[PDB]
């Protein structure tokens, strides 16, 4: 819901961690696209140590280039998704907001470059691209091209040239305590299978009455029987 979105050549990367991510609010301007690569979009009960939201403004016909193993103007030189992407390319038309006539030159894309982008590499540099033997001398000229070129959005164009805002969520998993657990409700007072982040068991879960100190995440009785457990998502004993 930010007022303005980053150009495709300087995409942002708002790291998200240590919160509860409700993925339902994202469902909603009509989401002409909501794809996911690696995880099933339909109904959020996994825990990731980091969520990276890369947000930008790409034209409509190039929303199809935000996809693993795809090539063209956007995926090669501006924003390169890896071959094993795990996340969800969300997009939606924004012809009302991002298509003024005072803000023609707010959205630029990288038309020239010497090699494809290493996955998740951002280049803001604006070095005059040299496409000839003679040196450019730092001033644009014949066979010396300035890379960034402007979309110059207009409100009267098609639905294939209108600013489709885009957000790419990548979910990442290290050997560190995962904290982005976004709410599964589980029944109490009745025999029920429980799977607490791989802690699998069967039993009756009840409102605990023992005082775990804040550094304790389990509970053992005599003879090492698991007597109490805390939820790694909502922290309930």
């Amino acid at each position: 819901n930010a007022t303005r979105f980053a150009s495709v050549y300087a995409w942002n990367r708002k790291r998200i961690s240590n919160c509860v991510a409700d993925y339902s609010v994202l469902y909603n301007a009509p989401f002409f696209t909501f794809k996911c690569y690696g995880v099933s979009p339909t109904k959020n009960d996994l825990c990731f140590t980091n969520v990276y939201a890369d947000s930008f403004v790409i034209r409509g016909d190039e929303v199809r280039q935000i996809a693993p193993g795809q090539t063209g103007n956007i995926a090669d030189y501006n924003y390169k998704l890896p071959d094993d992407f795990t996340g969800c390319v969300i997009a939606w038309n924004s012809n009302k907001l991002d298509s003024k006539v005072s803000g023609n030159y707010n959205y630029l894309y990288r038309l020239f470059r010497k090699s494809n982008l290493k996955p998740f590499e951002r280049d803001i540099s604006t070095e005059i691209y040299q496409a000839g033997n003679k040196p450019c001398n730092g001033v644009a000229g014949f066979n010396c091209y300035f890379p960034l070129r402007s979309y110059s959005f207009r409100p009267t164009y098609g639905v294939g040239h209108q600013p489709y805002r885009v957000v790419v969520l990548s979910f990442e998993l290290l050997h560190a305590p995962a904290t982005v657990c976004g709410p599964t409700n589980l029944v109490k007072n009745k025999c029920v299978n429980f799977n607490f982040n791989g802690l699998k068991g069967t039993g009756v879960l009840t409102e605990s009455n023992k005082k775990f100190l804040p550094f304790q995440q389990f509970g053992r009785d005599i003879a090492d029987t698991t007597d109490a457990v805390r939820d790694p998502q909502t922290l309930e004993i």
Epitope: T3, R4, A6, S7, N12, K14, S102, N106
Partner: antibody, heavy 123, light 110 residues
């Protein structure tokens, strides 16, 4: 505690481009929507460019539209303004101003200002 | 393109109340907030107000003032010989969407 360092200031010829690369220190960078405000000698301030916390530009002054490109890196704590195709009127001292908000355009007040750098464009 | 209109210069004896009027239109001042900036010679301009009345910590109480309509005003008293400076009215625009600035008014201590 908020020092805003400048760079890229020096005589540049009438047609060559330039890169003014402000910095920052002592405050969270990616929370605050920075700016770039010039002042010609013997004149008042003239807004030149803005930017937000997501590096989504606000818009350039009418006189410098399509020849100034403002960007930033929140990792290197910087804010670059790549001038293209300068001219005589573009000589000024460029403060790397600041905004308290992250949205820049509800009527904002610019708190901290760098000491600025002087760009002169003459033969 | 509406432009903020400060007085080119102001002069007053020390002690009196000094008025600096930044005049504009509905799009600029008639709809949003105006802030005021203080600049000494050879210095980077600094905050002297915001929210049309309020003051940053250290802001001279003697210099304060709010106005309605299409114009804003700054009021100054106890003019010390150091208070000679240039005062800028800063404003956002709702229609053209570019921050506007005042021409600048210079204060002289007689």
């Amino acid at each position: 505690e908020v020092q805003l360092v400048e760079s890229g200031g020096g005589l540049v010829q009438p047609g060559r481009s330039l890169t003014l690369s402000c910095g920052a220190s002592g405050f969270t960078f990616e929370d605050y929507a920075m700016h770039w405000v010039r002042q010609a000698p013997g004149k008042g301030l003239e807004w030149v460019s803005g930017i937000d916390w997501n590096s989504g530009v606000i818009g350039y002054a009418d006189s410098v539209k399509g020849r100034f490109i403002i960007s930033r890196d929140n990792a290197k704590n910087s804010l670059y303004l790549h001038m293209r195709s300068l001219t005589a009127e573009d000589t000024a001292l460029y403060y790397c101003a600041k905004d308290v908000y992250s949205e820049s355009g509800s009527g904002s007040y610019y708190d901290y200002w760098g000491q600025g750098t002087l760009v002169t464009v003459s033969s | 393109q509406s432009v903020l209109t400060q007085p080119p210069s102001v002069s007053a004896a020390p002690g009196q109340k000094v008025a600096i009027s930044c005049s504009g239109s509905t799009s600029n001042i008639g709809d949003n907030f105006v802030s005021w900036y203080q600049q000494f010679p050879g210095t980077a301009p600094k905050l002297l107000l915001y929210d049309d009345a309020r003051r940053p910590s250290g802001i001279p109480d003697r210099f304060s003032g709010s106005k309605s309509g299409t114009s804003a005003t700054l009021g100054i008293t106890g003019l010390q010989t150091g208070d000679e400076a240039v005062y800028f009215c800063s404003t956002w625009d709702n229609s053209l969407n570019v921050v506007l600035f005042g021409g600048g008014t210079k204060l002289t201590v007689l």
